Backbone:
RNA sequence: UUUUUUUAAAUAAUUU
RNA sequence: UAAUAGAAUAAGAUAAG
């Protein structure tokens, strides 16, 4: 077609169509023979496979990049001048146009710069490939959480794969990145060590969510979904909260029991979840996996513009 | 780059933008400029109005939306300090805010429109064209401002104060706004007359295109343009020949002695035509109505070689033109249907319905194309006319599509526009076909409205 | 190393668990700026938490400059921060002090807002009678800095200030004079009365008062030359012991007013060059320009001032290279060493020079003999080819003329310059000529280019003189123009002066008379 | 059967109908009391009780809309009247900010949901746009969707006359202090129905014809599709009141329809008035000046040009003789009337001149003495020149006053 | 190549 | 406790009412 002279430098309507990654945060991706620098130690992989989660030794982003990424989150929940490309999100907490004390966004990698760049970050993608038995890494989807000051709620105990039942094999990993300093008083993760090998790699029954109640009861709902032996290993190794810095990341298994604390600080707290999947991932039904996405059929290999390949060890 | 002040950043961003838009669209420069602009802030430093305007324009030019920090800072500066945006930097701000569609952008555009309306008597040759082009980028309906700018343009053109570039920019800007002024365009045409040899081939074709698009219905200047361009055909490029065909299809007057020469020149450069040029030539021949199989065979043979280069617009226009003329090219139609099925999500509201109707009119049914466009049809129902909805429904019925998730949007749209749906006589036959397939069971209210 | 108590305090600050007021944030920032033993600026996660506390605090309690200092110390560490804008006082809050505070915050924190300025002026109009004499001068200064266009309100304030002549001191009088001089739209009657006030109390002036009055006189222009007269005589008894910057301002005023009494100008220049070594880069540049504009650059004068400017020539500002290059020319004095280092400095910063500065530098260096055998010609040719898109008609003419005079040969650049100049027509023969000089170096151009060039030339031939006619004919024959209209126009212009084909007429002119 | 969800814009009746009926009756009683006044305290007591009842009704409606899925099950006419009442009760100061925003956010959400399905008819888009932009409620997606949907001119082809008049009146009344960002979209509402107005040109009544013309001209819009609309007015003069003729003259001047033949009828109809005012006199002078500049001394009828100038001058004298009855509100009116009189060499009796110059004296005296309260220096110079030209014996006080005003410097400059 | 420009305008009607 | 300024510069096709 003819792109007008003042529209030649524009970008696609949704950043899904942007093949590759823009150079905004860390420039361009390294060369094919330059991907060996971001490899992680085998002890980190062993710790992930033993505990069900692991904290990467080094922060993944510089402070200026974290500031820019937090500005993207701050502008993704404007509620006055709503974000451009808001329709390019799988879900939003502001669909009601009011929001609340908790802001959650999904599929923001198609809406803002930096967030689209964060998907192709080598530091986390190489580690995800190593976790996934050195295979192709494909984005599953994104998620952004923002809890307000003095009133932010807490997300109770949950299993990630319990929301991904339409994907056949368990071949997933979660990377959670703290865009702000976190603690037990503001959005720190609370994971159960060794909880990904409890029900023979199965899924625990969903927890009962009763809002408008204190955080202690919300975090104490664990004793209602476990059985006697799981009670014993919970007695032996109680849930542990991980303190995260301004850029530190955390790898989480899909089957690991996981919750987030509430926000009692004087400022909002932000975090970003990115879900990755391997090459050998299939669907179970006929239809789309996400709202307004490419539809697959039967046991169809999950691929397309909505699930880009972010790393290839070949 | 850290040692460079923001006044130098604006200059280098403008340099990068100028190199990008004109001297080839190198992605290297685009991504370097995007990376440089992504880490810039107008905070704590005193800056000129021109520097802020340049930063805003170069940021917005490189795909930066209204949620950016630099864009927000530049937009805020303009609002707080408005009088600092003189007529020299008004077009920059208007061009930057044209694509930005937000409350602050709307307010800024309105304030600059009023400023340009007040100061329309004091502009010179550069300012009038720059302002009118910048306001032609944005979609505005301030007729009074356009009339004042046209009066100033006529006053300046009486003393002969416009070059060929100024003339083409003015004509394009005024034809984009659909501002039909017989005297303004007569003055522009007479200024081209007076300029004479200073208007080259590269600067004459866009003038003819802009004069054809506005539609003045004046046969006195169309003949003159044909005569003036008849000597420049041998120098014309393929992209210029296609634009010439399109412009003189827009005019609507038949010039056989010119169309023959244009056809010969197009045949000479058949190896240089892309998909866009083929689609433009076919659409121009469809509009003007001449049926020339000899050029059509060459155009179809060329289009069979550049199938992978075809865009959704090109596919729609080429298929519609080939269907109108009753030309049978089974291989080309199969390849185009497969390609359209490949890029079904790029179709806009008009293109999807045009492609579906053109494929359904000819006895050509392909499940790869049919399923893809039927599924895509859901997202464009809300942007269609009553006649377009009727055409889309007939094409969907010819595909034998019965999925309720597809049929409910189109039936809702045709029910909301039922008066215009049933008031078009030329589609009456199509109506008695649509209800012949679906029957009274599907959407009873539409059937009852059809009976009445 | 942070001990347990310090570590826990730092953690509480990092987690936004401590409610900080603006005063406490200011104290912490002052401590960090004064003593770096704890490494506060070396912890990004601590300074970011302090900034987050700063945003969510009540900043109205602290002075505007305290908020500006917090913002500056956050910017220095790498955090993008800006103090909040103050709201316009409402209902009972309108008092003179509260309204002056809004302008002061707009000044110090660089958050200028025309709408709030207008609202403050409308609120301050009714209560203008409650202002103390000092607050009126503060308002005049604040409005002068903000580049306000409401000259009527500033005139009212000036009248009220001048009603209190006895109360005001010399410093206040000088500040009011310079602030009024900076405002563009002040009625000349108020300026005349203020200058009359300044004329008296002349001996009470201090060096800062002299500098302020000289700045005001420089801004005002020659119409106040009489007042400047009362300056010069008043400065005649103190010239032998005076500040260097004051003498530079004196020379600038002498250049601006076009002073006629040469004895005082010579006295001031001779006193200036004694202490010219104490001047900064900008002051030295302005003094060097002023001495040139007054025809006072003798051999000793130029040598002494060039010896001083060579010191700053090593790291000269890009805005200062072109002026001293201009002063180096148009004088019959040796300046080889100055021009060498100036050309080297221009080479160093070739990638940051704007289009106008590059064109100017090339224009001055066009006719310089030692500039041809330099890398600068080639580097500037590439830079000009890059920057042709950002060049106006004047920059185009300057750059093309400078490159053509230097012997720079590049057909593509000259063709691109001609095409760029075809986009906006050449108003003058001086603008059009450099394109012809550049294109005549290669001796060939497309027929369309020479055809458009002739179309441009033919109208212009009705005013050019005989020398310009000969030069245009030379360029036209070099480019190979076959159009008859242009040659007919040039021959018609020639006939006006000659009226006949003189036998002695240069052989080149007879060919023109045949209208080839 | 297909699960279509298209309900008529103007059956499927929910409790929203009853709530809107209660609100309608309350507003009707309040407006009836408002008419009845023309016991203020007892009146305002009943107004307060009705306001409390309406606030309770709206609170119940908002709670029902929040808790239950009522909007999806509701019709569409009920949604339109709910939007109307939510926007209207805010201008009447019967609702708070929080409740108004809560009620409008869900209305916009439901409107966007119905837009996604495509059931938004060609009339409901115009209705929602007019009742959202005039209330100055900003939603980015809603505004962008409406603006993009207002460019499909083929949809807005068979709009009813009542809808056109109601939307035009709604846009016209709230024009005075509308926000700038709301202007452009307002114009896109007017141009969407411009052809319906043009084909409805021979159907409007005379009072509403001028209303449409003023609504279009006040939004700096003079579309060609409304060209017959003006022409009929030019061919229907004499049925207008004398005051309306001034606005008709201004409109016809802005539509490039103002010729010599209509000027005579317009000025005669102006002079048929019982007593002139500043508006009729100013419009008449502007029309006379405009028709005075349309004569060419070297055209086809160059020999006929001077008689036309004499006719224009005499009919200007007709107005000029009646220049003492009017009351000038501001100096620019005087400086325009006197400029027209001097430029066209119109003769004015000394009595009218004395009254005119007496009126301006009080104004300049107010400006000079009060000094607290915008006569610029150039306007004062023009007034001084006018007084000197006509003679200083007319107003000897004004000459000294204005000369002292220049000496003191009270009058500001045009630059400031 | 000779068309035209310069107000503070505020009077529609409705259950949306 | 905190206040100093410089530059003058033009790109150009949306399947319409």
Residues:
């Amino acid at each position: 077609s003819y792109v007008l002279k003042f529209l030649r430098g524009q970008l696609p309507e949704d950043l899904k169509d942007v093949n590759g990654a823009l150079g905004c945060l860390y420039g361009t991706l390294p060369d094919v023979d330059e991907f060996g620098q971001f490899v992680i130690s085998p002890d980190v992989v062993n710790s992930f496979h033993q505990f069900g989660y692991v904290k990467m030794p080094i922060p993944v982003l510089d402070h200026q990049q974290i500031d820019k990424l937090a500005d993207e989150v701050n502008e993704l929940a404007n509620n006055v001048e709503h974000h451009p490309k808001t329709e390019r999100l799988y879900a939003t907490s502001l669909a009601d146009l009011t929001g609340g004390p908790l802001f959650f966004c999904q599929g923001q990698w198609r809406a803002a710069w930096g967030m689209h760049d964060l998907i192709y970050l080598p530091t986390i993608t190489v580690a995800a490939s190593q976790i996934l038995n050195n295979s192709l890494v494909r984005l599953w989807y994104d998620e952004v959480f923002m809890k307000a000051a003095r009133t932010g709620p807490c997300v109770p105990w949950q299993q990630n794969y319990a929301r991904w039942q339409h994907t056949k094999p368990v071949n997933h990993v979660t990377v959670m990145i703290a865009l702000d300093t976190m603690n037990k008083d503001r959005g720190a993760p609370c994971l159960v060590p060794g909880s990904h090998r409890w029900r023979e790699g199965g899924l625990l029954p969903p927890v009962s969510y009763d809002p408008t109640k204190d955080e202690a009861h919300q975090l104490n709902t664990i004793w209602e979904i476990i059985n006697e032996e799981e009670g014993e290993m919970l007695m032996d190794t109680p849930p542990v909260t991980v303190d995260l810095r301004r850029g530190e990341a955390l790898l989480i298994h899909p089957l690991t029991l996981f919750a987030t604390h509430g926000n009692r600080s004087l400022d909002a707290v932000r975090c970003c979840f990115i879900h990755y999947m391997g090459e050998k991932t299939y669907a179970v039904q006929n239809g789309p996996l996400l709202p307004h996405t490419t539809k697959f059929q039967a046991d169809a290999m999950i691929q397309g513009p909505f699930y880009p390949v972010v790393f290839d060890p070949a | 780059v850290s040692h460079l002040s923001a006044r130098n950043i604006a200059t280098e961003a403008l340099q990068m933008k100028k190199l990008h838009q004109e001297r080839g669209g190198n992605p290297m420069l685009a991504q370097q400029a995007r990376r440089v602009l992504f880490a810039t802030s107008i905070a704590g430093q005193n800056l000129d109005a021109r520097s802020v305007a340049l930063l805003l324009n170069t940021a917005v030019y490189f795909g930066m939306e209204s949620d950016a920090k630099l864009v927000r800072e530049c937009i805020d500066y303009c609002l707080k300090n408005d009088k600092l945006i003189t007529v020299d930097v008004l077009p920059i701000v208007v061009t930057a805010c044209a694509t930005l569609k937000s409350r602050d952008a709307r307010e800024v555009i309105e304030m600059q429109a009023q400023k340009a309306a007040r100061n329309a008597k004091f502009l010179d040759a550069k300012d009038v064209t720059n302002i009118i082009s910048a306001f032609s980028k944005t979609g505005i309906n301030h007729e009074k401002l356009f009339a004042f700018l046209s009066r100033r343009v006529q006053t300046l053109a009486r003393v002969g104060e416009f070059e060929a570039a100024h003339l083409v920019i003015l004509a394009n800007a005024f034809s984009r706004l659909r501002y039909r002024d017989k005297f303004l365009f007569g003055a522009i045409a007479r200024r081209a007359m007076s300029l004479r040899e200073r208007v080259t081939v590269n600067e004459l074709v866009p003038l003819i295109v802009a004069f054809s698009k506005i539609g003045l219905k004046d046969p006195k200047l169309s003949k003159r343009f044909a005569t003036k361009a008849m000597e420049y055909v041998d120098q014309m490029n393929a992209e210029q020949v296609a634009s010439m065909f399109m412009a003189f299809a827009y005019f609507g007057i038949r010039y056989d002695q010119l169309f023959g020469v244009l056809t010969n020149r197009a045949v000479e450069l058949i190896d240089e035509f892309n998909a866009q040029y083929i689609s433009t030539t076919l659409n121009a021949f469809q509009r003007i109505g001449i049926n020339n199989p000899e050029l059509f065979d060459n155009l179809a043979e060329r289009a069979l070689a550049v199938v992978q280069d075809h865009d959704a617009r090109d596919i729609s226009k080429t298929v519609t033109a080939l269907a109108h003329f009753g030309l049978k090219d089974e291989e080309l139609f199969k390849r185009l249907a497969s390609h359209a099925a490949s890029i079904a999500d790029q179709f806009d509201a008009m293109g999807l319905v045009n492609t579906a109707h053109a494929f359904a009119r000819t006895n050509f049914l392909q499940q790869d194309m049919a399923v893809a466009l039927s599924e895509r049809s859901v997202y464009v129902c809300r942007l269609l006319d009553a006649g377009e909805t009727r055409r889309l429904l007939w094409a969907l019925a010819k595909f034998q599509v019965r999925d309720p998730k597809i049929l409910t949007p189109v039936f809702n749209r045709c029910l909301a526009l039922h008066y215009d749906f049933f008031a078009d006589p030329t589609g009456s036959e199509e109506i008695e076909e649509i209800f012949d397939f679906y029957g009274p069971n599907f959407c009873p209210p539409l059937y009852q409205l059809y009976i009445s | 190393a942070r001990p347990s108590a310090l570590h826990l305090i730092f953690e509480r600050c990092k987690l936004n668990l401590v409610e900080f007021t603006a005063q406490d944030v200011y104290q912490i920032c002052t401590t960090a700026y004064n003593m770096d033993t704890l490494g506060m600026l070396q912890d990004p996660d601590f300074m970011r938490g302090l900034h987050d506390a700063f945003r969510r605090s009540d900043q109205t309690v602290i002075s505007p400059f305290q908020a500006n200092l917090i913002a500056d110390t956050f910017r220095k560490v790498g955090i993008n921060s800006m103090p909040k804008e103050v709201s316009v006082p409402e209902e009972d809050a309108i008092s003179p002090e509260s309204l002056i505070l809004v302008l002061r915050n707009m000044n110090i924190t660089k958050q200028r807002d025309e709408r709030k300025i207008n609202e403050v002026l409308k609120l301050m109009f009714p209560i203008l009678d409650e202002f103390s004499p000092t607050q009126l001068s503060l308002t005049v200064t604040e409005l002068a800095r903000l580049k306000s266009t409401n000259a009527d309100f500033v005139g009212k304030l000036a009248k009220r200030i001048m009603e209190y002549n006895d109360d005001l001191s010399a410093l206040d009088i000088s500040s009011a004079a310079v602030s009024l001089a900076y405002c563009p739209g002040i009625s000349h009657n108020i300026l005349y009365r203020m200058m009359q006030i300044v004329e008296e109390r002349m001996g009470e002036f201090q060096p800062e008062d002299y500098i302020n009055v000289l700045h005001a006189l420089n801004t005002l222009g020659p119409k106040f030359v009489n007042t400047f007269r009362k300056i010069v005589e008043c400065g005649l008894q103190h010239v032998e012991n005076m500040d260097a910057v004051t003498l530079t301002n004196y020379m600038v005023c002498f250049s601006t007013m076009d002073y006629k009494q040469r004895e005082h100008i010579d006295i001031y220049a001779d006193a200036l060059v004694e202490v010219a070594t104490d001047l900064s880069e900008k002051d030295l540049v302005m003094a060097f320009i002023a001495l040139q504009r007054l025809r006072l650059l003798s051999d000793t004068m130029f040598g002494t001032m060039a010896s001083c400017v060579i010191r700053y020539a090593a790291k000269m500002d890009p805005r200062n290279i072109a002026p001293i290059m201009d002063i180096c020319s148009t004088v019959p004095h040796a300046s080889d060493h100055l021009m060498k280092v100036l050309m080297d400095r221009a080479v160093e910063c070739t990638r940051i020079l704007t289009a106008n500065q590059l064109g100017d530098i090339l224009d001055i260096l066009g006719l310089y003999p030692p500039a041809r055998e330099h890398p600068l010609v080639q580097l500037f040719g590439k830079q000009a080819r890059l920057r042709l898109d950002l060049m106006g008609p004047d920059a185009l003419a300057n750059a093309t003329r400078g490159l053509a005079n230097l012997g720079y040969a590049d057909p593509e650049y000259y063709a691109q310059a001609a095409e760029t100049g075809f986009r906006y027509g050449f108003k003058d023969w001086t603008l059009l000529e450099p394109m012809l000089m550049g294109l005549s170096i290669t001796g060939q151009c497309p027929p369309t280019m020479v055809r458009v060039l002739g179309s441009h030339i033919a109208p212009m031939a009705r005013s050019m003189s005989l020398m310009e006619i000969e030069r245009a004919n030379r360029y036209l024959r070099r480019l190979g123009c076959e159009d008859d209209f242009v040659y007919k126009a040039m021959a018609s212009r020639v006939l006006q002066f000659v009226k006949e084909v003189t036998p002695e007429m240069p052989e080149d002119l007879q060919v023109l008379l045949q209208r080839g | 059967p297909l699960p279509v969800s298209y309900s008529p814009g103007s059956v499927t009746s929910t409790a929203i109908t009853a709530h809107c009926d209660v609100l309608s009756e309350c507003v009707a009683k309040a407006d009836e009391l408002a008419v009845q006044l023309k016991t203020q305290e007892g009146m305002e007591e009943f107004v307060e009780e009705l306001k409390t009842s309406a606030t309770n009704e709206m609170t119940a409606l908002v709670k029902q809309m929040q808790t239950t899925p009522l909007l999806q099950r509701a019709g569409m006419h009920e949604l339109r009247r709910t939007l109307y009442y939510t926007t209207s009760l805010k201008e009447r100061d019967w609702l708070e900010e929080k409740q108004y925003t809560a009620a409008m956010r869900m209305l916009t959400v439901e409107v966007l949901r119905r837009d996604g399905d495509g059931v938004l008819s060609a009339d409901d888009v115009l209705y929602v746009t007019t009742h959202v932009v005039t209330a100055n409620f900003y939603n980015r997606h809603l505004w962008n969707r409406m603006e993009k949907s207002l460019l499909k001119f083929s949809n807005y082809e068979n709009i009813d006359m009542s809808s056109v008049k109601a939307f035009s009146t709604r846009l016209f009344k709230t024009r005075r202090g509308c926000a700038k960002e709301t202007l452009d979209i307002r114009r896109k509402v007017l141009l969407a129905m411009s052809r319906r107005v043009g084909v409805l040109a021979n159907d409007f009544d005379l009072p509403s014809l001028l209303g449409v013309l003023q609504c279009y001209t006040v939004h700096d819009l003079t579309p060609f599709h409304l060209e017959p609309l003006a022409i009929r007015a030019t061919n229907h003069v004499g049925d207008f009141t004398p005051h309306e003729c001034a606005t008709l003259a201004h409109v016809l001047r802005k539509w490039r329809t103002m010729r010599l033949e209509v000027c005579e009828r317009l000025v005669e109809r102006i002079c048929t008035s019982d007593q002139l005012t500043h508006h009729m006199a100013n419009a008449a002078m502007i029309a006379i000046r405009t028709c005075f500049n349309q004569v060419s001394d070297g055209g086809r009828n160059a020999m006929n040009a001077e008689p036309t100038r004499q006719k224009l001058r005499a009919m200007g004298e007709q107005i000029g003789c009646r220049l003492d009855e009017v009351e000038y509100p501001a100096l620019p009116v005087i400086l325009s009337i006197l400029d027209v009189v001097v430029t066209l060499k119109i003769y004015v009796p000394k009595k009218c001149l004395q009254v005119i110059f007496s009126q301006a004296n009080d104004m300049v005296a107010i400006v000079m003495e009060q000094k607290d309260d915008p006569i610029t220096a150039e306007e004062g110079r023009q007034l001084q020149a006018l007084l000197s030209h006509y003679g200083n014996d007319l107003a000897p006080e004004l000459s000294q006053r204005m000369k002292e005003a220049f000496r003191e410097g009270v009058l500001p400059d045009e630059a400031s």
In short: Chain D touches chain C through six residues (CB under 8 Å). The first helix of chain D runs from residue 15 to 37.
